[PDB]
Each structure stands twice: as structure tokens, then as C-alpha cells.
Amino acid sequence: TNHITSLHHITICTGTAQGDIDFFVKVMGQRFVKRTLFYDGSIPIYHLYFADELGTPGTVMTTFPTRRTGQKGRKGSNQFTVCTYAIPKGSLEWWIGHLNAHGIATGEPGTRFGQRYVGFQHPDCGIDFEVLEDENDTRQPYDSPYVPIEHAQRGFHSWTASVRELEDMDFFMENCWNFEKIGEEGNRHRYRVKGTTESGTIIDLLHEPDRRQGSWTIAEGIIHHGAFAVPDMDIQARIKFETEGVGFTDFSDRKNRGYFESTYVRTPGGVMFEATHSLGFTHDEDERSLGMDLKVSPQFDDKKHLIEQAMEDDPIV
Amino acid sequence: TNHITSLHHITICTGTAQGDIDFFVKVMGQRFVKRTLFYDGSIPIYHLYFADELGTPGTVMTTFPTRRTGQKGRKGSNQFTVCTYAIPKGSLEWWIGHLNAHGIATGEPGTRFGQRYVGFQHPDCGIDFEVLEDENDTRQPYDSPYVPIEHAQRGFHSWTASVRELEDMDFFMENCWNFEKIGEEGNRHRYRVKGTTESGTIIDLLHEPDRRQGSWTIAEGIIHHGAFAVPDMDIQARIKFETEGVGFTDFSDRKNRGYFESTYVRTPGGVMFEATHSLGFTHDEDERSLGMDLKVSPQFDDKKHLIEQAMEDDPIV
Ligand SMILES: [Fe+3]
Ligand SMILES: [Fe+3]
């Protein structure tokens, strides 16, 4: 195949680094697979990665703990609003259990397209999550402590985008982005990668024309963008060219973000999309010891003291 | 100075090429300064340029006659909606006159921030224009036939953008784009290049949260983007970096568009902005004979017959 294939990673702005470890590792049972430090013009900021065992597309979660900038983002309508993990069928109560046990309030369990889910928030920034019973998801769960292999989530089921302009967003998914509407209930419209069988291939659009646009900038409490897996850099370039061709001339240059190749476009629904080529997480760290070594970026050669600043104010354990 | 300095060009999708010549040259009294042919994946499409004598920033108008694609764009709320020329004071009636004479209906003359204007449409696609009496505009009018030098427009006064999200758009103008709010009347908020004295430095934002978003894609009847003059490619790159830094990672690669260097970003108001470096219109054509030679692009080497297709169905006289 030669177009975007599935979801790849999602990227959110959170509070403290320890907040995320406590949540993504100790609560969700994901492996801490990479940690990096970059300089954002003012202060050092972590870029943390969380996935299954080896950072496979459709399970990767990336975070910028951004409590140390004053910026607090506004939940709103032109952004991703909810990230949804797939858990095995029958596992909801255990999750409600091992979530409440951790002090994380959960909400009214529901059904969405026939499958059960419950919502809850990242304790340290407010971002919205769900666990959803997918009997059709056969992906290998990562075996951590914290969560037994019987009940482990096995990657992302779907992401939910709030959008004010639905018609033109639908056009973009079908014509530029290799998705097709596969369902609709209420104001929720569900799109799936054309052809696919794998899980982690679902984007739900919430039509909310009424609602004020959310924050687009890097600020605490927000999902900054969603990324989609593309087989290689050629398909990437082609998607960029044809998408520019129809008018989205804001398709970015290809950026190396460490462990993947990224191009960014602002869709007519107001949501940043990424077309991503995968680089792996092992090329600079031992498989057995992922997430232990802090990869600090070359901008710190002149200001090493800031590394020490990040380690104590945003401590990682 | 080392930031964006003024307006540069505006780029609109129109009907037929003859439509634009009849309008921009024969009605507005602008010089036809360049004409090019490119291939858009389906059909040949002109890219026409209209300005003062030598294509100076703040007077350049570019058009894609797009009647030959079926696509008809939707006027709406996340786009540029009105382009405004500056005419001398006392000249409004002559214009109302030489516009009506040409069959172009004009509307209720008005006053905006103390200055008089009248609206009217491109006869061949529907796009909205204004002439506005600016006694403070001292730029050299181009001396065409069609319009006497006494009454000639001397460039763009302002552009008017409709936007649903005003607050975050204001933030973007001040913090990334070197503009500052200088006035407000009703739902019109006026921004001007920080510091400037020159004319052609004004962007008016119309706050319209109620209104459905317009078309973003290349389609007849729409303004696709506005471009802003930047002194050189270094300032350009810096603006790209700092703007990406706060979250607009969709800032495009620098593209050579023939007669200028362009980078594109989708602002939080939903409007495409360009940071433009100028290349001039003479580097490939004689000053005395601008707009006479059709510069066809290298994509036509394999399909020369399409050049002949454009010349007769979109004839230029
Ligand atoms: Fe990304
Ligand atoms: Fe442009």
C-alpha cells in the first residue's frame, strides 16, 4: 500500500514529568520508552515517549510537560479532545477499579457504536482519556507490572476531534487523507483508513459548530496534534504535493523529530495532522534500558546548567 | 528593520483571464506585468500578475483564472473577504462614474475610520473590492490609459479578513506578525505594521463567530491568501522558527513562486498568511514589454498541446 496506513502517535501538553510517568506507566501500563530534553527559547522542557514494548505505531504517546511555562491551554473546538485506548472485552470493571484505586475519577460508562467505554482525566493536566472494549483488537499488550496482561490496553482505538467545519473536513479526509466515513451517530462521524483491517485506524469527528475554538499553541491541558503512519518518505512527499496542489500550501517541510520524520498541515477542521515516517526508539538506546538515559539536545552545550534545572524542578522517578 | 514590513501581494481565484485583464487593466488601471502558465494536475491554468509600473510590494495582485475547473468557492468566514485600493481624496465620484460606465454596479458609499469608500465586485467571479480615499497615500500611481493620473489608485490601502476566533488571532498578529491593534469600530478591528509610516500596511479583522467558514481550497470566487513583505530570507527563516516554536508547526518550506520567495502558515483566524521575499518581474522579461510574453512552465515539455488549449479557451487580448 502507498498512502497513510494508520494512527501513529499523539502529542499532548501536560503538567509535570512525574505526572506523566505516574499516569502512563503506573496507571495505564505503558512502557516509558524515551525521554529527551530540549530548550524552548526560555526553559528546558522534557519530551517524553510512552508506548508498548518497542514503540510501534498506534501505541505511542508523546508529551511535553509544560507546567513550568505559565501557559495553560483552553479546551475547545478545533482540536483533538479525547484519546481512546483499546482494552479487552470484559475488562472495563477492572479498569474502573484500578483507576479509582489510583484516585482517578471515572464517569458514566457508555456505549459507542456497540462497544463499552469509560472516560477519565489525566490527574496532572486535565486531558481526556477513555478505555474502550475492543474485541477486534488483537495487538500484543505490553507486559508491565502495574497492570496484569489479562486486562492490559493494547494501543489506541481511536482519537476524537472536535471540528466546527464538518463538510470541508469530510472532503479532506476522503480526498487527501485516505479515510472514509464508516458510520455516524448523533454528531459523531467515524472515519477509518480506507481498506484497513488493523486496529488503531479510527478517527471520530465531533461536529460542534457552536463551540469556540480551542488553543492551537503549546500550552498545558491540550492535544497539540495527531500523527498518522506513512510507509516512507516518498509517499509522504507525494501526500504533501497533492495536498498543496488543492490549496493547503501550509504543508510544512519534513522535520526530523528524533524518532520519526514529520510533515504538518492544518486541516480545514482546524486540526493539525502529521504524516509520519518511523525511525524507531532503539537507534540511540539499548532495548533493555529504554527511557532511563536522558537524551539532552545540542542546544544545551552553551547552557548545561539548565539540565540540572530540569532534573530537580521536574524530577523523574 | 528586521520583521515583516508591509503588505506585498494578494492572490485570488477568478473566472477567465480576459475577465481579469478587462478588470485589472481596463477598469482599475493597473499594468499587466506578468503572465505564466502552469499545470495543476488536470488542466493548464494561468497565473497572472497585475501591479504598478514595476511590481512594487503593496500593489501586486495575482490571480488564477479558475473557471475551467468546475470548482466554485464559497465566500465565508475564515478568509480574506475584501481587497481595498487607495485612491486620492475627492476622486470617489469619478471612480463611481468610471465604474458604472463599465457596467460594474457599486454600492452605498460609506465612511470607515473617517475615510470614504465604495464597494463593488469583479464582474467575472464575484470577489469584493473597494476604492478608499486616502489623503495620506503618496505612492506613485501607474500612468495607464483607461484612467487619468489625477484619479489613479496608488496601491492597496488595506485587506479585510473575516475571522471566527478573534482573541487568538489578535495574539498572533502582535506576537508573531509585527502588527498592533490601532483602532476598532463595531466588529472591525484594525491592525497596522508596528512602527510603519508607509501606506499598504493595514489589515482589518472582521470578527464574525456566527458565520460558516469559507472555502480554503483553490476555487472560483475566493481569496486564497495574503502575502506580507519581508526584507530577506533570514528574517523569513527567523519568523518561521519562532512561529513554529509556539506551535504552528505547519509553517511551510520556502517555495520559489517565480517572482518571489514564499512561506505559508495557517493562522488561528483561519487565514493563510505568506512571508514573502521579492524577486522582481524583470529578471526574465524586458521592462518595456512586461506581460506580453507567456512564461510557460517546464511541466509542459511533455504536453505542449495544452498550451494551445489555454490560448483559445482562455484567450488573452
Ligand atoms: Fe507529532
Ligand atoms: Fe502568495
XYZ file of C-alpha atoms and ligand atoms in Angstrom:
636
model
C 0.000 0.000 0.000
C 1.123 3.557 -0.644
C -0.848 6.003 1.497
C -1.219 6.698 5.209
C -1.824 3.396 6.930
C -2.978 4.014 10.499
C -2.608 6.233 13.558
C 0.953 6.652 14.714
C 1.431 8.901 17.716
C -0.469 11.580 19.546
C 1.185 14.539 21.212
C -0.159 16.326 24.249
C 0.941 19.109 26.594
C 0.819 18.016 30.234
C 1.911 19.268 33.671
C 4.934 17.665 35.326
C 7.051 14.802 34.053
C 6.347 12.755 37.188
C 2.683 13.389 36.483
C 3.003 11.523 33.209
C 5.109 8.618 34.434
C 2.675 8.139 37.330
C -0.108 8.107 34.748
C 1.188 6.486 31.600
C 3.393 3.903 33.244
C 1.918 3.340 36.747
C -1.760 3.624 35.717
C -2.084 2.775 32.020
C 0.714 0.213 31.979
C 2.701 1.637 29.110
C 6.451 1.368 28.831
C 8.472 4.548 29.359
C 10.463 4.227 26.095
C 12.277 7.539 25.623
C 12.938 10.780 27.416
C 14.589 13.835 25.933
C 15.328 17.385 26.965
C 15.049 20.368 24.578
C 15.172 24.153 25.030
C 12.048 26.060 24.003
C 13.518 29.564 23.890
C 13.029 30.111 27.618
C 13.302 26.970 29.736
C 14.198 23.261 29.415
C 11.189 21.077 28.622
C 11.012 17.307 28.527
C 9.777 15.390 25.555
C 8.652 12.019 26.921
C 7.573 8.986 24.955
C 5.357 6.148 26.135
C 4.339 3.092 24.152
C 4.199 -0.679 24.017
C 7.450 -2.627 24.169
C 9.204 -1.170 21.119
C 7.275 1.997 20.213
C 5.028 0.549 17.498
C 2.732 2.985 15.591
C -0.755 3.173 17.078
C 0.502 2.927 20.668
C 2.879 5.847 21.001
C 2.047 8.727 23.287
C 4.243 11.765 23.469
C 4.067 14.518 25.997
C 5.527 17.920 26.727
C 5.236 18.545 30.461
C 4.549 22.265 30.300
C 3.628 23.299 33.828
C 6.836 25.334 34.074
C 5.700 27.751 31.371
C 2.828 29.843 32.690
C 0.726 28.862 29.625
C -2.485 26.977 30.347
C -4.354 25.840 27.235
C -8.066 26.129 26.540
C -10.102 23.043 25.724
C -12.305 23.950 22.792
C -13.475 23.078 19.334
C -10.750 22.950 16.700
C -8.566 20.235 18.192
C -8.293 16.663 19.361
C -10.383 16.366 22.542
C -10.253 12.687 23.663
C -7.684 9.891 23.292
C -9.140 6.342 23.453
C -7.253 3.169 24.442
C -8.422 -0.290 23.427
C -8.856 -2.790 26.323
C -10.052 -6.400 26.063
C -13.779 -7.173 26.292
C -14.964 -7.740 29.868
C -12.122 -5.655 31.240
C -13.977 -2.383 31.890
C -14.741 -3.016 35.585
C -11.174 -3.951 36.397
C -10.114 -0.652 34.775
C -12.793 1.330 36.586
C -11.385 -0.450 39.613
C -7.640 0.059 39.055
C -8.397 3.681 38.074
C -10.479 4.553 41.131
C -7.854 2.789 43.268
C -5.421 5.373 41.922
C -7.682 8.292 42.783
C -8.682 8.988 39.169
C -12.405 9.746 38.934
C -14.212 7.947 36.130
C -17.519 8.845 34.545
C -20.710 7.234 33.330
C -19.780 4.132 31.341
C -21.344 4.268 27.923
C -21.661 2.578 24.591
C -20.273 3.961 21.338
C -21.043 2.047 18.155
C -21.840 -1.022 20.250
C -18.703 -1.022 22.373
C -18.373 -0.033 26.034
C -16.090 2.739 27.270
C -15.469 4.892 30.313
C -13.959 8.371 30.405
C -11.428 9.853 32.823
C -8.772 12.530 33.059
C -5.032 12.803 33.326
C -4.771 13.734 37.038
C -1.991 16.220 36.344
C -3.282 18.390 33.416
C -6.922 17.571 32.671
C -6.661 15.900 29.265
C -9.455 13.428 28.476
C -8.962 9.687 28.059
C -11.082 6.628 27.511
C -10.739 2.887 27.701
C -12.937 1.072 25.193
C -13.694 -2.654 24.918
C -12.469 -3.775 21.502
C -12.910 -7.500 20.985
C -11.483 -6.999 17.494
C -8.128 -5.635 18.704
C -5.525 -8.388 18.621
C -2.393 -6.384 19.236
C 0.215 -7.592 21.729
C -0.195 -5.821 25.073
C 2.999 -4.751 26.787
C 3.534 -6.742 29.997
C 4.311 -4.259 32.770
C 3.811 -4.660 36.485
C 1.055 -2.212 37.471
C -1.438 -3.959 35.140
C -1.968 -7.700 34.536
C -1.673 -8.968 30.992
C -5.332 -10.113 31.164
C -6.573 -6.514 31.263
C -3.819 -4.506 29.534
C -4.771 -1.937 26.910
C -3.358 -2.899 23.537
C -2.891 0.518 21.899
C -5.107 3.403 20.705
C -8.567 2.546 19.483
C -9.494 5.959 18.140
C -8.968 9.679 18.557
C -11.845 12.152 18.746
C -11.561 15.542 17.090
C -13.897 18.402 17.739
C -14.437 20.456 14.486
C -16.572 23.483 13.574
C -16.480 22.924 9.812
C -17.552 19.369 9.104
C -18.325 19.385 5.342
C -14.907 20.552 4.221
C -13.256 18.332 6.849
C -15.033 15.298 5.440
C -13.729 16.321 1.975
C -10.201 16.467 3.329
C -10.305 13.035 4.952
C -11.615 11.317 1.814
C -9.656 13.218 -0.836
C -6.276 13.945 0.780
C -6.091 11.674 3.784
C -7.174 8.156 2.792
C -10.031 7.918 5.255
C -13.672 7.164 4.564
C -16.778 7.769 6.644
C -17.849 4.378 8.054
C -20.557 5.401 10.498
C -22.446 8.208 12.138
C -24.336 8.513 15.382
C -25.609 11.861 16.618
C -22.930 14.447 15.888
C -20.185 11.832 15.908
C -18.929 10.847 12.445
C -16.496 7.947 12.264
C -13.693 7.620 9.735
C -11.382 4.676 9.167
C -8.316 4.220 6.966
C -9.547 3.116 3.534
C -9.246 -0.667 3.242
C -7.549 -1.387 6.583
C -8.038 -4.351 8.924
C -5.673 -3.412 11.740
C -6.810 -1.657 14.872
C -5.654 1.895 15.658
C -7.107 3.201 12.429
C -10.058 5.222 13.633
C -10.701 8.961 13.829
C -14.056 10.174 15.128
C -15.135 13.700 14.235
C -17.426 15.583 16.595
C -19.335 18.279 14.740
C -19.559 21.275 17.107
C -20.129 24.495 15.036
C -21.427 26.244 18.148
C -18.250 25.830 20.226
C -15.396 28.348 20.496
C -12.100 27.169 19.019
C -9.588 25.668 21.452
C -5.948 26.641 21.852
C -3.602 25.789 18.997
C -0.389 26.698 20.774
C 1.784 24.668 23.156
C 0.000 25.077 26.487
C -0.878 22.815 29.431
C -4.018 20.712 29.041
C -4.158 20.468 25.253
C -3.648 17.912 22.480
C -1.337 19.629 20.038
C -1.627 17.288 17.059
C -2.302 13.801 15.844
C 0.136 11.874 13.668
C -0.531 9.217 11.040
C 1.752 6.446 9.872
C 3.064 6.641 6.354
C 5.165 3.784 4.872
C 8.095 6.013 3.741
C 9.327 9.483 2.770
C 8.216 9.177 -0.867
C 4.583 8.585 -0.025
C 4.981 11.401 2.474
C 6.270 13.799 -0.218
C 3.502 12.792 -2.599
C 0.805 13.420 0.002
C 2.389 16.821 0.622
C 2.415 17.700 -3.083
C -1.156 16.713 -3.901
C -2.449 18.353 -0.724
C -0.582 21.579 -1.520
C -1.974 21.271 -5.037
C -5.553 21.788 -3.860
C -4.623 24.793 -1.718
C -3.043 23.739 1.602
C 0.219 25.441 0.869
C 0.991 25.445 4.613
C 2.179 21.836 4.417
C 5.458 22.010 6.339
C 8.938 20.934 5.401
C 9.859 17.404 6.597
C 11.259 17.664 10.145
C 13.391 15.101 11.987
C 11.852 14.868 15.450
C 14.293 12.259 16.772
C 12.399 9.012 16.406
C 10.282 9.908 13.383
C 10.063 12.047 10.180
C 7.243 14.602 10.320
C 5.298 16.923 7.986
C 2.496 19.144 9.331
C -0.689 20.557 7.774
C -3.581 22.491 9.313
C -6.743 20.786 8.038
C -9.949 22.714 7.335
C -11.368 21.335 10.589
C -8.729 23.304 12.446
C -6.784 20.231 13.494
C -3.040 19.729 12.940
C -2.316 16.445 11.161
C 1.096 14.845 10.791
C 2.282 12.456 8.119
C 4.918 10.431 9.920
C 7.746 8.181 8.888
C 9.061 5.923 11.683
C 12.658 5.878 12.891
C 12.421 3.564 15.926
C 13.459 4.224 19.524
C 16.414 1.848 19.731
C 18.793 3.517 17.275
C 20.212 5.546 20.179
C 19.459 3.377 23.232
C 19.570 -0.238 24.386
C 16.296 -2.188 24.082
C 16.575 -3.470 27.649
C 17.045 0.031 29.042
C 14.665 2.369 27.168
C 13.702 5.604 28.927
C 16.476 5.530 31.512
C 19.004 7.681 29.710
C 18.085 11.348 29.265
C 18.902 12.399 25.688
C 19.588 16.130 26.012
C 19.685 18.187 22.816
C 22.694 20.082 21.330
C 21.205 23.449 22.342
C 22.408 22.797 25.866
C 26.130 22.784 25.075
C 26.241 26.505 25.925
C 23.831 26.290 28.866
C 24.456 22.991 30.675
C 23.172 24.426 33.978
C 19.606 24.195 32.679
C 19.798 20.397 32.525
C 20.317 20.496 36.303
C 17.324 22.892 36.454
C 15.016 20.401 34.753
C 16.161 17.421 36.851
C 15.114 18.878 40.185
C 12.075 21.006 39.413
C 10.680 18.409 37.039
C 12.156 15.321 38.798
C 11.805 11.896 37.178
C 11.402 8.686 39.222
C 14.233 46.961 10.284
C 14.090 43.188 10.556
C 10.490 41.969 10.527
C 7.621 41.987 8.044
C 7.335 45.484 6.660
C 4.055 45.842 4.772
C 1.541 44.095 2.526
C 3.064 42.558 -0.557
C 0.648 40.734 -2.825
C -2.792 39.231 -2.630
C -3.823 36.134 -4.532
C -7.326 35.414 -5.732
C -9.099 32.779 -7.821
C -11.093 34.338 -10.659
C -13.002 33.266 -13.786
C -11.414 33.854 -17.189
C -8.114 35.525 -17.970
C -9.829 38.104 -20.188
C -12.097 38.776 -17.234
C -9.109 39.913 -15.214
C -7.389 41.977 -17.890
C -10.704 43.721 -18.607
C -10.936 44.416 -14.881
C -7.456 44.987 -13.544
C -6.054 46.776 -16.556
C -9.074 48.328 -18.355
C -11.016 49.281 -15.194
C -8.571 49.663 -12.301
C -5.704 50.978 -14.408
C -3.057 48.535 -13.296
C -0.240 47.359 -15.507
C -0.379 43.764 -16.747
C 3.164 42.868 -15.582
C 3.471 39.089 -15.914
C 1.582 36.118 -17.241
C 2.515 32.494 -16.738
C 1.050 29.105 -17.495
C 1.278 26.132 -15.089
C -0.324 22.673 -14.980
C -2.490 21.930 -11.947
C -2.716 18.153 -12.306
C -5.621 18.352 -14.747
C -5.623 21.434 -16.967
C -3.443 24.466 -17.813
C -4.171 27.472 -15.603
C -2.839 30.988 -15.946
C -1.078 32.789 -13.174
C -1.465 36.493 -13.966
C 0.174 39.402 -12.213
C -1.030 42.993 -12.096
C 0.669 45.899 -10.371
C 2.052 49.396 -10.708
C 4.878 50.007 -13.163
C 7.468 47.595 -11.761
C 5.569 45.270 -9.403
C 6.307 47.050 -6.116
C 5.065 45.392 -2.868
C 1.687 46.715 -1.751
C 0.346 46.979 -5.310
C 0.667 43.466 -6.666
C -2.414 41.447 -7.468
C -2.163 37.870 -8.578
C -4.907 35.760 -9.999
C -5.637 32.198 -11.005
C -8.440 32.253 -13.566
C -10.176 29.067 -12.486
C -13.427 28.950 -14.433
C -12.161 25.931 -16.376
C -12.103 23.752 -13.263
C -15.660 23.074 -12.144
C -14.773 24.322 -8.619
C -16.712 27.341 -7.389
C -15.579 28.640 -3.998
C -17.759 29.647 -1.068
C -17.481 33.120 0.413
C -17.443 32.689 4.166
C -15.715 33.438 7.413
C -12.146 32.181 7.661
C -10.613 34.078 4.759
C -9.853 37.423 3.199
C -13.183 38.912 2.072
C -12.449 42.401 0.624
C -9.441 43.970 -1.119
C -9.220 47.791 -0.813
C -7.399 50.149 -3.207
C -6.268 53.616 -2.178
C -7.481 56.478 -4.449
C -6.794 60.200 -3.996
C -9.180 62.318 -1.908
C -12.048 63.777 -3.947
C -11.764 61.004 -6.504
C -14.642 58.774 -5.359
C -17.277 60.154 -7.766
C -15.032 59.810 -10.782
C -14.499 56.161 -9.764
C -18.198 55.582 -9.156
C -18.512 57.122 -12.598
C -15.807 55.194 -14.486
C -17.033 52.008 -12.753
C -20.710 52.403 -13.626
C -19.640 53.354 -17.164
C -18.089 49.894 -17.329
C -21.246 48.166 -16.135
C -19.882 47.391 -12.659
C -22.535 48.036 -10.006
C -21.312 49.963 -6.981
C -22.876 50.137 -3.550
C -23.672 52.625 -0.824
C -20.631 54.853 -0.340
C -19.566 54.828 3.268
C -17.038 56.031 5.761
C -14.539 53.792 7.541
C -12.330 55.389 10.178
C -13.070 58.797 8.665
C -12.295 57.936 5.059
C -14.765 57.417 2.209
C -15.027 54.202 0.208
C -17.337 52.420 -2.195
C -17.656 48.678 -2.739
C -18.026 46.721 -5.976
C -17.365 43.314 -7.470
C -15.101 41.720 -10.013
C -17.628 41.288 -12.866
C -16.221 37.880 -13.760
C -16.034 35.954 -10.412
C -17.725 37.946 -7.647
C -14.765 38.908 -5.461
C -15.244 42.100 -3.432
C -13.263 45.297 -3.952
C -13.222 48.813 -2.617
C -11.729 52.151 -3.502
C -10.953 54.278 -0.455
C -9.916 57.942 -0.286
C -6.500 58.042 1.370
C -5.094 61.555 1.521
C -2.092 60.080 3.333
C -1.091 57.757 0.471
C 1.741 59.314 -1.507
C 2.732 56.402 -3.685
C 3.360 56.898 -7.405
C 0.302 55.891 -9.434
C 0.981 53.969 -12.616
C 0.036 56.049 -15.670
C -2.118 53.869 -17.922
C -4.671 54.943 -20.479
C -8.070 53.849 -19.131
C -7.631 56.048 -16.021
C -6.225 59.596 -15.750
C -3.303 60.156 -13.426
C -5.469 62.583 -11.389
C -7.702 59.748 -10.171
C -5.478 56.645 -10.330
C -5.402 54.269 -7.373
C -1.943 54.159 -5.847
C -1.847 50.618 -4.423
C -3.654 48.618 -1.704
C -4.905 50.512 1.305
C -5.939 47.530 3.391
C -7.220 43.977 3.261
C -10.203 42.792 5.293
C -10.209 39.341 6.844
C -13.260 37.667 8.237
C -12.315 35.523 11.337
C -14.300 33.403 13.810
C -11.638 33.356 16.528
C -10.601 36.919 17.250
C -8.738 36.663 20.599
C -6.140 34.173 19.439
C -5.874 35.970 16.083
C -5.061 39.216 17.858
C -2.351 37.310 19.801
C -0.876 36.063 16.550
C -0.712 39.482 14.905
C 1.030 41.105 17.879
C 3.342 38.264 18.910
C 4.336 36.575 15.635
C 3.389 39.014 12.920
C 4.584 42.507 13.870
C 1.170 44.126 13.784
C -0.579 46.065 16.519
C -4.230 46.946 17.001
C -4.601 50.655 16.138
C -8.368 51.057 16.149
C -11.728 49.405 16.499
C -15.185 50.276 15.281
C -18.069 47.843 15.622
C -16.744 44.376 14.833
C -13.932 45.768 12.707
C -10.514 45.725 14.398
C -7.680 47.466 12.582
C -4.051 46.378 12.672
C -1.037 48.150 11.222
C 2.609 47.129 10.878
C 4.365 48.118 14.110
C 6.151 51.442 13.612
C 5.442 51.944 9.896
C 4.715 55.175 8.015
C 4.181 53.834 4.506
C 0.771 53.079 3.097
C -0.258 49.499 2.263
C 0.330 48.384 5.820
C -3.182 47.784 7.067
C -5.122 44.614 7.850
C -8.671 44.920 9.168
C -10.135 41.954 11.025
C -13.883 41.399 10.955
C -14.992 39.368 13.954
C -17.756 37.030 12.720
C -18.013 33.991 15.105
C -21.518 33.299 13.815
C -20.534 32.797 10.158
C -19.701 29.469 8.491
C -16.094 29.128 7.350
C -15.384 29.920 3.696
C -13.532 27.739 1.213
C -9.812 27.256 1.769
C -9.100 25.483 -1.496
C -8.393 26.879 -4.971
C -11.872 27.629 -6.306
C -13.504 30.443 -8.298
C -14.608 33.480 -6.299
C -12.203 33.226 -3.370
C -9.151 34.997 -1.948
C -6.664 32.225 -1.324
C -4.102 34.066 0.793
C -2.499 37.348 1.656
C 1.248 37.915 1.488
C 3.448 40.234 3.533
C 6.761 41.774 2.580
C 9.815 40.618 4.443
C 13.237 42.260 3.831
C 15.119 38.972 3.137
C 15.290 35.193 3.577
C 16.964 35.375 7.000
C 14.184 37.378 8.589
C 11.825 34.994 6.833
C 13.526 31.938 8.392
C 13.537 33.551 11.819
C 9.823 34.334 11.648
C 9.246 30.712 10.646
C 11.296 29.376 13.564
C 9.761 31.487 16.318
C 6.259 30.902 14.959
C 6.839 27.138 14.827
C 8.246 27.442 18.339
C 4.882 28.453 19.794
C 3.040 25.648 17.998
C 2.388 26.498 14.326
C 4.437 23.628 13.046
C 2.577 23.863 9.715
C 4.839 26.713 8.602
C 5.774 25.612 5.083
C 9.126 25.185 3.430
C 10.292 28.255 1.442
C 8.888 27.995 -2.104
C 10.108 29.821 -5.216
C 6.948 31.088 -6.898
C 8.724 32.769 -9.819
C 8.872 36.401 -8.791
C 9.029 35.936 -5.025
C 10.129 33.603 -2.156
C 7.186 32.316 -0.111
C 6.496 30.575 3.222
C 2.922 29.757 4.295
C 1.232 29.417 7.700
C -2.420 28.923 8.642
C -3.122 31.478 11.382
C -5.560 30.792 14.224
C -8.082 33.038 12.465
C -8.202 30.515 9.653
C -6.415 32.767 7.190
C -3.341 31.768 5.159
C -0.507 34.270 5.589
C 2.632 34.427 3.476
C 6.017 35.811 4.415
C 7.404 36.951 1.088
C 10.808 37.830 -0.244
C 10.755 39.810 -3.516
C 12.440 38.692 -6.728
C 11.203 41.331 -9.204
C 9.375 40.845 -12.501
C 12.123 41.966 -14.871
C 14.680 39.211 -14.287
C 13.046 37.229 -17.109
C 11.395 39.927 -19.250
C 12.070 43.369 -20.703
C 10.765 46.326 -18.662
C 9.159 47.901 -21.726
C 7.299 44.705 -22.592
C 6.015 43.174 -19.329
C 3.049 40.803 -19.599
C 3.313 40.209 -23.335
C 5.378 37.047 -23.274
C 3.684 33.955 -21.839
C 6.125 32.188 -19.498
C 5.006 28.552 -19.657
C 6.345 26.178 -17.006
C 8.629 23.119 -17.527
C 5.735 20.716 -16.876
C 4.549 21.364 -20.407
C 7.579 19.891 -22.176
C 5.740 16.551 -22.371
C 2.315 18.050 -23.100
C 2.806 21.104 -25.331
C -0.695 20.722 -26.821
C -2.200 22.068 -23.599
C -0.569 25.465 -24.135
C -2.657 25.711 -27.319
C -5.666 24.636 -25.194
C -5.228 27.538 -22.784
C -4.686 30.148 -25.521
C -8.055 29.662 -27.181
C -10.409 28.721 -24.365
C -8.885 31.290 -22.040
C -7.864 33.828 -24.745
C -5.807 36.877 -23.773
C -6.196 40.261 -25.516
Fe 3.952 14.546 16.046
Fe 1.335 34.384 -2.370
